[PDB]
Write an enzyme that holds these catalytic residues in place. Structure first.
Site, mmCIF file in Angstrom:
data_model
loop_
_atom_site.group_PDB
_atom_site.id
_atom_site.type_symbol
_atom_site.label_atom_id
_atom_site.label_comp_id
_atom_site.label_asym_id
_atom_site.label_seq_id
_atom_site.Cartn_x
_atom_site.Cartn_y
_atom_site.Cartn_z
ATOM 1 N N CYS A 144 -1.634 2.205 -2.711
ATOM 2 C CA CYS A 144 -2.308 2.997 -2.401
ATOM 3 C C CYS A 144 -1.634 4.439 -2.677
ATOM 4 N N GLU A 148 -7.051 2.019 -14.248
ATOM 5 C CA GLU A 148 -6.604 3.095 -13.041
ATOM 6 C C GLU A 148 -5.094 3.637 -13.648
ATOM 7 N N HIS A 160 -28.276 19.602 -1.051
ATOM 8 C CA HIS A 160 -28.199 20.220 -1.887
ATOM 9 C C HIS A 160 -27.641 21.542 -2.200
ATOM 10 N N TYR A 214 -8.960 -2.996 -11.449
ATOM 11 C CA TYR A 214 -8.709 -1.968 -11.619
ATOM 12 C C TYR A 214 -7.473 -1.093 -11.678
ATOM 13 N N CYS A 220 0.915 -1.439 -0.449
ATOM 14 C CA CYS A 220 0.096 0.284 -0.040
ATOM 15 C C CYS A 220 0.790 1.302 0.055
ATOM 16 N N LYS A 235 -0.191 5.478 -5.878
ATOM 17 C CA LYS A 235 -1.145 5.795 -7.022
ATOM 18 C C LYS A 235 -1.982 7.224 -6.363
HETATM 19 C C1 LIG Z 1 -28.222 32.950 -1.470
HETATM 20 C C2 LIG Z 1 -28.398 32.225 -1.051
HETATM 21 C C3 LIG Z 1 -27.670 31.079 -1.155
HETATM 22 C C4 LIG Z 1 -28.552 29.716 -0.242
HETATM 23 N N1 LIG Z 1 -27.216 28.169 -1.186
HETATM 24 C C5 LIG Z 1 -28.041 27.542 -0.863
HETATM 25 C C6 LIG Z 1 -27.888 26.111 -0.952
HETATM 26 O O1 LIG Z 1 -26.666 26.152 -1.395
HETATM 27 N N2 LIG Z 1 -28.632 24.725 -0.481
HETATM 28 C C7 LIG Z 1 -29.959 24.859 0.256
HETATM 29 O O2 LIG Z 1 -30.496 24.088 0.700
HETATM 30 N N3 LIG Z 1 -30.035 25.563 0.224
HETATM 31 C C8 LIG Z 1 -29.483 27.712 -0.109
HETATM 32 N N4 LIG Z 1 -30.813 28.540 0.155
HETATM 33 C C9 LIG Z 1 -31.450 29.108 1.105
HETATM 34 C C10 LIG Z 1 -33.048 27.841 -0.469
HETATM 35 O O3 LIG Z 1 -32.625 28.621 -1.393
HETATM 36 C C11 LIG Z 1 -34.423 28.541 0.865
HETATM 37 O O4 LIG Z 1 -34.664 28.114 1.604
HETATM 38 C C12 LIG Z 1 -35.497 27.337 -0.295
HETATM 39 O O5 LIG Z 1 -35.589 28.516 -1.258
HETATM 40 C C13 LIG Z 1 -36.765 27.903 0.127
HETATM 41 O O6 LIG Z 1 -37.704 27.422 0.128
HETATM 42 P P1 LIG Z 1 -40.099 28.174 -0.335
HETATM 43 O O7 LIG Z 1 -40.326 27.084 -1.018
HETATM 44 O O8 LIG Z 1 -40.206 28.059 0.874
HETATM 45 O O9 LIG Z 1 -39.640 29.320 -0.820
HETATM 46 P P2 LIG Z 1 -38.588 29.636 -2.474
HETATM 47 O O10 LIG Z 1 -38.125 28.683 -2.849
HETATM 48 O O11 LIG Z 1 -37.556 31.325 -1.716
HETATM 49 O O12 LIG Z 1 -39.630 30.769 -3.430
HETATM 50 C C14 LIG Z 1 -40.978 31.383 -2.951
HETATM 51 C C15 LIG Z 1 -41.559 31.550 -4.533
HETATM 52 O O13 LIG Z 1 -42.510 32.142 -4.412
HETATM 53 C C16 LIG Z 1 -43.081 33.680 -5.224
HETATM 54 N N5 LIG Z 1 -43.872 34.552 -3.910
HETATM 55 C C17 LIG Z 1 -43.822 34.798 -2.932
HETATM 56 N N6 LIG Z 1 -44.507 35.748 -2.701
HETATM 57 C C18 LIG Z 1 -45.969 35.330 -2.765
HETATM 58 C C19 LIG Z 1 -47.455 35.617 -3.494
HETATM 59 N N7 LIG Z 1 -47.951 37.112 -2.539
HETATM 60 N N8 LIG Z 1 -47.861 35.349 -4.602
HETATM 61 C C20 LIG Z 1 -47.261 34.717 -6.010
HETATM 62 N N9 LIG Z 1 -45.647 34.720 -6.185
HETATM 63 C C21 LIG Z 1 -45.201 34.660 -4.251
HETATM 64 C C22 LIG Z 1 -41.627 33.543 -4.803
HETATM 65 O O14 LIG Z 1 -41.428 34.686 -6.067
HETATM 66 C C23 LIG Z 1 -40.902 32.666 -5.370
HETATM 67 O O15 LIG Z 1 -40.420 32.106 -6.305
HETATM 68 C C24 LIG Z 1 -29.563 29.411 -0.363
HETATM 69 C C25 LIG Z 1 -30.093 31.420 -0.203
HETATM 70 C C26 LIG Z 1 -29.201 32.228 -0.752
HETATM 71 C C27 LIG Z 1 -30.493 33.131 -0.658
HETATM 72 C C1 LIG Z 2 -1.251 -0.884 -7.738
HETATM 73 C C2 LIG Z 2 -1.612 -1.250 -6.735
HETATM 74 C C3 LIG Z 2 -2.653 -0.032 -5.805
HETATM 75 C C4 LIG Z 2 -2.778 -0.463 -5.443
HETATM 76 N N1 LIG Z 2 -4.121 0.502 -4.816
HETATM 77 C C5 LIG Z 2 -4.927 0.216 -3.440
HETATM 78 C C6 LIG Z 2 -6.081 0.931 -2.575
HETATM 79 O O1 LIG Z 2 -5.988 2.054 -3.507
HETATM 80 N N2 LIG Z 2 -6.590 0.739 -1.872
HETATM 81 C C7 LIG Z 2 -6.577 -0.633 -0.994
HETATM 82 O O2 LIG Z 2 -7.275 -0.719 -0.437
HETATM 83 N N3 LIG Z 2 -5.881 -1.618 -1.888
HETATM 84 C C8 LIG Z 2 -4.362 -0.976 -2.919
HETATM 85 N N4 LIG Z 2 -3.915 -1.759 -3.377
HETATM 86 C C9 LIG Z 2 -4.378 -2.641 -2.908
HETATM 87 C C10 LIG Z 2 -2.977 -3.135 -1.138
HETATM 88 O O3 LIG Z 2 -2.536 -2.372 -0.954
HETATM 89 C C11 LIG Z 2 -3.127 -4.919 -0.638
HETATM 90 O O4 LIG Z 2 -4.436 -5.176 -0.900
HETATM 91 C C12 LIG Z 2 -1.947 -4.886 0.606
HETATM 92 O O5 LIG Z 2 -1.053 -4.137 0.307
HETATM 93 C C13 LIG Z 2 -2.270 -5.921 1.328
HETATM 94 O O6 LIG Z 2 -1.948 -6.606 2.506
HETATM 95 P P1 LIG Z 2 -0.692 -7.337 3.114
HETATM 96 O O7 LIG Z 2 -1.202 -6.833 4.540
HETATM 97 O O8 LIG Z 2 -1.496 -9.098 2.754
HETATM 98 O O9 LIG Z 2 0.318 -6.733 2.519
HETATM 99 P P2 LIG Z 2 1.164 -6.347 2.168
HETATM 100 O O10 LIG Z 2 1.004 -4.985 2.757
HETATM 101 O O11 LIG Z 2 1.608 -6.557 0.473
HETATM 102 O O12 LIG Z 2 2.898 -6.057 2.548
HETATM 103 C C14 LIG Z 2 3.615 -7.990 3.082
HETATM 104 C C15 LIG Z 2 4.845 -7.472 3.241
HETATM 105 O O13 LIG Z 2 5.540 -8.431 3.531
HETATM 106 C C16 LIG Z 2 6.717 -8.331 3.392
HETATM 107 N N5 LIG Z 2 7.531 -10.426 3.109
HETATM 108 C C17 LIG Z 2 7.039 -10.649 2.741
HETATM 109 N N6 LIG Z 2 7.375 -12.420 2.240
HETATM 110 C C18 LIG Z 2 8.184 -11.697 4.018
HETATM 111 C C19 LIG Z 2 8.490 -13.064 4.587
HETATM 112 N N7 LIG Z 2 8.646 -14.080 3.967
HETATM 113 N N8 LIG Z 2 8.686 -12.272 5.090
HETATM 114 C C20 LIG Z 2 9.236 -11.333 6.264
HETATM 115 N N9 LIG Z 2 9.022 -10.241 5.261
HETATM 116 C C21 LIG Z 2 8.224 -10.531 4.261
HETATM 117 C C22 LIG Z 2 7.018 -7.264 2.455
HETATM 118 O O14 LIG Z 2 8.179 -7.691 2.155
HETATM 119 C C23 LIG Z 2 5.464 -6.328 2.538
HETATM 120 O O15 LIG Z 2 6.902 -5.469 2.843
HETATM 121 C C24 LIG Z 2 -3.371 -1.561 -4.498
HETATM 122 C C25 LIG Z 2 -2.069 -2.493 -4.907
HETATM 123 C C26 LIG Z 2 -1.719 -2.548 -6.412
HETATM 124 C C27 LIG Z 2 -0.507 -2.971 -6.679
#
Ligand SMILES: Cc1cc2nc3c(=O)[nH]c(=O)nc-3n(C[C@H](O)[C@H](O)[C@H](O)COP(=O)(O)OP(=O)(O)OC[C@H]3O[C@@H](n4cnc5c(N)ncnc54)[C@H](O)[C@@H]3O)c2cc1C
Ligand SMILES: Cc1cc2nc3c(=O)[nH]c(=O)nc-3n(C[C@H](O)[C@H](O)[C@H](O)COP(=O)(O)OP(=O)(O)OC[C@H]3O[C@@H](n4cnc5c(N)ncnc54)[C@H](O)[C@@H]3O)c2cc1C
Ligand SMILES: N[C@@H](CCC(=O)N[C@@H](CSSC[C@H](NC(=O)CC[C@H](N)C(=O)O)C(=O)NCC(=O)O)C(=O)NCC(=O)O)C(=O)O
Ligand SMILES: N[C@@H](CCC(=O)N[C@@H](CSSC[C@H](NC(=O)CC[C@H](N)C(=O)O)C(=O)NCC(=O)O)C(=O)NCC(=O)O)C(=O)O
Lengths: 461, 461
Positions: free
Chosen positions: A46, A184, A450, A180, A41, A49
């Site tokens: 791991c 990769e 969201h 894999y 690894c 890589k």
């Molecule tokens: C900057 C910014 C970023 C945000 N980012 C996120 C985010 O990443 N994730 C998240 O989950 N929330 C986010 N929010 C919050 C989210 O937008 C609000 O919580 C969500 O839209 C609320 O839903 P609502 O159904 O009560 O009303 P709203 O979706 O606000 O809409 C009410 C609608 O009713 C209409 N309306 C109003 N009064 C009347 C009426 N008298 N008659 C008819 N039409 C009318 C309005 O025009 C509007 O289109 C963010 C808010 C702001 C401002």
């Molecule tokens: C390319 C590549 C990418 C990988 N990428 C991932 C990844 O992203 N995620 C993941 O989860 N796994 C990944 N793996 C798999 C992961 O590396 C192995 O499954 C993991 O290391 C296994 O563990 P182990 O304990 O059996 O042995 P190992 O960790 O392989 O090690 C055994 C150790 O024992 C020593 N040894 C061997 N025989 C003896 C002996 N007779 N006496 C004393 N010393 C000895 C070895 O030298 C070594 O250091 C990858 C493998 C390869 C090759």
């Protein structure tokens, strides 16, 4: 022969956790490591890589620069620069891991362990003998490479290991594999600039994942400049004065085989599989059972057939992931030292993320597996497909596909599969929920966040 | 007077969902909207804001270009370019929303609704009268602005609305407010280039979030070039021939008030609060109860004191979020039309993400609220603080802080709080798990996804 309470062979992911956990429980442990600590690894997995991935992901967003009102930067990625840093990081994690071992009073017997012919399970590292009432085999695996006999010239290609030794960005890359890793490498090399070709025996990649992922991933790959050569095989490899010449056979069902040459190849990467590091442990000295491919046969509790010996991690051949090796090493220590007789890893609902572009996230059963476990009549699947609002203003595009698999009439989420931006960090929570036995209602009764891509999973209708 | 089964006043977030849900249930609905559909979120909220956020996030990663081996691009963000696109998108969502209404056979009575003196609840839009056995008030709110009488010159500053009307990047910005909006504007304007100052009555921002978020967010803000003027107040505002002159008083506890001038101000943004759109509905015609600040008083089921009238969303003054308006509009339709007598929104464990840099994610109880709900003896909190590996090779840095709040001896996760990269997409799953009543064991018994920031939440010790 020096006695310890635990002797874990392998300073890898599963190895260390079990060592650390054991020490907390008052056990006298020691870890045997023949190379750098942190195993695969940290040194060639791991960690290295993922740095390359963050880098490839950087190449992409740069393309989107002008669309976001920013001027454009030429490009010309300098690989040396980043390879140097990636390495620095990896060498800083080494010092760290070492530190933590000594902080936990865990000895590190630096060298290569091998079992001995001594009646009771005893191991030998550089002449010295060490034994323990409990020994763990966490030796992991190695990248596999074809034989010259099968594919003449095979030795000319590199593996993921070799990839991490690369000093400069190869002009032309051909990767052979559809898992894999293969994917990769294809993703990183292509984003950073190499003219990449991914060579697969079939029509799709990640053929073990849900069909949607398999399909979408083959698509996104193509749509990003990676050439997918479906139904192709490298017949033999040759070193020309300009590069490598990959001679490959392409046999599309319904068509006649076509032999082809891919010339001027800078890199031929073999991402066809992993083999276990079991050979030189001299397992035969104790009769420690293994399979035809050398993995080590274990039970629900990581037990070998030999009393006192266990095995966890890649070496076993199951769920080859760091967190899985880790989780099983953790549970073992608690079983042996905390006496939790039923402490074992549940290998169901293990989450996994593939770092493709965009990232793949998955946990649970595929549709097929749910179908064959519950029966068609009992499996419902929900899905959506949308383009993330990040691409609302960009000309470059990628999708996001989400699929929910539900079992029985309660709609127990037995599997989640998705691909797209944010899916790498988006998966953990759902894996926990999924692990808990969450139904589609629990998902649907959660207030959405969201705008996010994650809100889509909780509003599937 | 024309009869419908449902007459929802307001084509906003809560308004529409309830309208759509009602139609699916066979109800004859119509939506009254006086402006553009999609309400606040789509026109001056979630949607336009988030595009600006993706853009600000783009400015940041560009800084990290050279560290990732890429050459550097000067900069000089063109606001016009992006404002044009942001607007295009917003106008494409409008057409869409309209479409969906007509696809669902939902009439849109374009205009301003007001209740009438007619005995039974009846409303009047442009001379015409319309009634229904169930009427919903989803009129949301408006940005508040100080009175000239209080702060002379207040009318000179803009609000979030005005922010979305801005055509070019203001050279100098001063924002007055310490809530998520204030913070988000501060984040975007500063990342894109304006010399931003955020003006807060206290020492910290987001003072209602867990103390950790409050503290960390004030920090990250400062560390990114935003000037936080703690304990300050705009005394009066003046229009000079060069910009605006903000005269503000700064009263740090233990010190003597210091009056100060901030000159050459291009933008003075008022992000001090939201007021309800209730005034002109002529609620007094029916005696529809409201509070001192004009919000509409409702019960667990969104009922007003008047039979047949409900209210949801911002207008009520509670949990001002799109997904909350939406969720409550959804449940109401199912209650009234599907007869689910106990269909209502659970206002506990509502998840929220603030789009600061890095993003904040939170759900559940703060430490304080858990302390005052369960008692100190019964509240445990777990936390970690690490720098994401994205910054393993960058000189620019940001942290990641995670805090888990646990109640009683079972360790029921009653609240999660975090800040850092990926926290925006990382929160949904945990909100679902948290909603389910997950304990720290359920989290800790989930196999980690390595390498991610999300794995930290499931390995807190
Ligand atoms: C900057 C910014 C970023 C945000 N980012 C996120 C985010 O990443 N994730 C998240 O989950 N929330 C986010 N929010 C919050 C989210 O937008 C609000 O919580 C969500 O839209 C609320 O839903 P609502 O159904 O009560 O009303 P709203 O979706 O606000 O809409 C009410 C609608 O009713 C209409 N309306 C109003 N009064 C009347 C009426 N008298 N008659 C008819 N039409 C009318 C309005 O025009 C509007 O289109 C963010 C808010 C702001 C401002
Ligand atoms: C390319 C590549 C990418 C990988 N990428 C991932 C990844 O992203 N995620 C993941 O989860 N796994 C990944 N793996 C798999 C992961 O590396 C192995 O499954 C993991 O290391 C296994 O563990 P182990 O304990 O059996 O042995 P190992 O960790 O392989 O090690 C055994 C150790 O024992 C020593 N040894 C061997 N025989 C003896 C002996 N007779 N006496 C004393 N010393 C000895 C070895 O030298 C070594 O250091 C990858 C493998 C390869 C090759
Ligand atoms: N999750 C963040 C944290 C940053 C990170 O990479 N931190 C780790 C490198 S993970 S690379 C090594 C890997 N991971 C870990 O040590 C920590 C990851 C997580 N807690 C898990 O258990 O999966 C592993 O082999 N662990 C062996 C074991 O504990 O059994 C490090 O700095 N650790 C030094 C330390 O421990 O303080 C990220 O990935 O960005
Ligand atoms: N989640 C992705 C999806 C992309 C997106 O922005 N899609 C929406 C804009 S969300 S801006 C408007 C907002 N959201 C929605 O309509 C969908 C978001 C989610 N399903 C939810 O219910 O929270 C809302 O006011 N809804 C009213 C209601 O349904 O009650 C759109 O294209 N929708 C057109 C369509 O509906 O097909 C993202 O945010 O990037």
């Amino acid at each position: 022969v020096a006695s310890y309470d635990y002797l874990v062979i392998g300073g890898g992911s599963g190895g260390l956790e079990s060592a650390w956990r054991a020490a907390e429980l008052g056990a006298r442990a020691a870890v045997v490591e023949s190379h750098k600590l942190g195993g695969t690894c940290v040194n060639v997995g791991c960690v290295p890589k993922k740095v390359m991935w963050n880098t490839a992901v950087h190449s992409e967003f740069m393309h989107d620069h002008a669309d976001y009102g920013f001027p454009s930067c030429e490009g010309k990625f300098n690989w040396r620069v980043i390879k140097e840093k990636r390495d620095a990081y990896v060498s800083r994690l080494n010092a760290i891991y070492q530190n933590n071992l000594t902080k936990s009073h865990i000895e590190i017997i630096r060298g290569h362990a091998a079992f001995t012919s001594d009646p009771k399970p005893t191991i030998e590292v550089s002449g010295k003998k060490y034994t323990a009432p409990h020994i763990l085999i966490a030796t992991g695996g190695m990248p596999s490479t074809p034989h010259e006999s099968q594919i003449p010239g095979a030795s000319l290609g590199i593996t993921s290991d070799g990839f991490f030794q690369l000093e400069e960005l190869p002009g032309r890359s051909v990767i052979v594999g559809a898992g894999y890793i293969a994917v990769e490498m294809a993703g990183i090399l292509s984003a950073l600039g190499s003219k990449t070709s991914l060579m697969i025996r079939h029509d799709k990649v990640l053929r073990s994942f849900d069909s949607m992922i398999s399909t979408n991933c083959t698509e996104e790959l193509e749509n990003a400049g990676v050439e997918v050569l479906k139904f192709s095989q490298v017949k033999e490899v040759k070193k020309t004065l300009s590069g490598l010449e990959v001679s490959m056979v392409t046999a599309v069902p319904g068509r006649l085989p076509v032999m082809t040459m891919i010339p001027d190849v800078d890199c031929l990467l073999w991402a066809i599989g992993r083999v276990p590091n079991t050979k030189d442990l001299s397992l035969n000295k104790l009769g420690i059972q293994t399979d035809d491919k050398g993995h080590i046969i274990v039970d629900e509790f990581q037990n070998t057939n030999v009393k006192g010996i266990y095995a966890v991690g890649d070496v076993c051949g199951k769920a080859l992931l760091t967190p899985v090796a880790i989780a099983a090493g953790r549970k073992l220590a608690h079983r042996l030292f905390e006496y939790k007789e039923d402490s074992k890893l549940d290998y169901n609902n293990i989450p996994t993320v593939v770092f493709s572009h965009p990232p793949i996230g998955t946990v649970g059963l595929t549709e097929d597996e749910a179908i064959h476990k519950y029966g068609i009549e009992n499996v419902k699947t929900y899905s959506t497909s949308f383009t993330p609002m990040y691409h609302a203003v960009t000309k470059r595009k990628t999708k996001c596909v989400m699929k929910m698999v539900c079992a029985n009439k309660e709609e127990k989420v037995v599997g989640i599969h998705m691909q797209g931006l944010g899916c790498d960090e988006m998966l953990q929570g759902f894996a926990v929920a999924v692990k808990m036995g969450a139904t589609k209602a629990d998902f649907d009764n959660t207030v959405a966040i969201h705008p996010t891509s994650s809100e889509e999973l909780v509003t599937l209708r």
